[model samples]
Target: HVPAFLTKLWTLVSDPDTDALICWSPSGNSFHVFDQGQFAKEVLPKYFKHNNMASFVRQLNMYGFRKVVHIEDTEFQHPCFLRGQEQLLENIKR
Candidate 1:
């Protein structure tokens, strides 16, 4: 269920009109770059390893900008943000 959303995102970004995809892990763990046009397929495998990706995600979840206790593949599709929180991008955070 969780992995399928990732696949759906790829499908959306891989469209002929789309240029690139900016993805985050299950709960904004780490930023993932998905380039379109020529180098699309080639970008993932090199960056998708266990330590390179999975461990990185684990590290991020453990030490993200805002810690989240629980997450899942919910039907509610929207960005996650800290509640009653920071409003300054120049203070420079997400």
Candidate 2:
């Protein structure tokens, strides 16, 4: 489940510069972002309708996201948050 805040979420991702993320709205042109993760063809399928975790995951996999086994998938938020946070801490340590 991607977050709305991920819109134009490239700079935050590509801080040290590795990956990228872009976004596009119905009206505005696509937003090109240098995220540290690989993303492309910025199509927000259900930004206005729904949040289908399964469908989204299938699409994300096509773009290079590999899903891991988890009993409580909802708990994934914590892991992702920690990953990002760990990166921040590493940055500070350096």
Candidate 3:
């Protein structure tokens, strides 16, 4: 079974309405936040109940996610976090 944290994370990124703010990376093995300011302002409060990017990143880190350095976007990835691979989420542990 997927952990509650992973479930929430997946739901957030998979939501169509937030596609412009955040979504899966082109490779489908990662996710990117197109606009951190917008995401922290518009998305976090509704989903995470807070608008702190640092807090969000802390949670991702706890689940083994790593930040991917990119010039244009803030991206994060993990071995078990992928598109069409919800089952793999069970493998992700804190």
Candidate 4:
């Protein structure tokens, strides 16, 4: 069962009625944050420099990311998010 705070956060972020998810990360130097998962990736690795996957997973669990065990059986799926040529695309668009 999820905590009440997280339940409310899920409801708030999931609401399509508003563009509330167009977020800004105010950590050190704030930036317009479109994806939270990406933001967490940068922060977590820097904050806790775990040399291996197991240590990384343990750190994440300590931080309340409950479903992180899903990656225990991790496989490198040929995913679209991995292949990013956004800068090249910008040149094309230009």
Which prediction has the highest TM-score against the true structure? 3
Weakest 10 consecutive residues of candidate 1 by summed lDDT: 73-82
Q: Write the per-residue lDDT of candidate 1 for residues 7-33, one digit (tens) a residue.
A: 334343333443334334444323334
Candidate 1 ranges beyond 4 A from true positions: 1-19, 23-51, 65-94
Ranking of models by lDDT:
3, 1, 2, 4
What would the per-residue lDDT of candidate 2 be over residues 1-94, giving only the tens digit for each residue? 3433332232333244322333222232222332212232233332323334455445334433333344671111212222233232222210
The local lDDT score (0 to 100) that residue 61 gets in candidate 3 is 90
Which pairs of residues have clashing backbones in candidate 3?
Answer: none
Q: Could you say which candidate leads in lDDT?
A: 3
Descending-TM-score candidate ranking: 3, 2, 4, 1
**Candidate 3 TM-score to native:** 0.89
Clashing pairs in 4: none
> lDDT tens string, model 3, 16-87?
788899899878889989889889988889888999988999999999898899467888999998887877
lDDT of each: 0.33, 0.30, 0.87, 0.30
TM-score computed on alpha carbons, candidate 2: 0.25
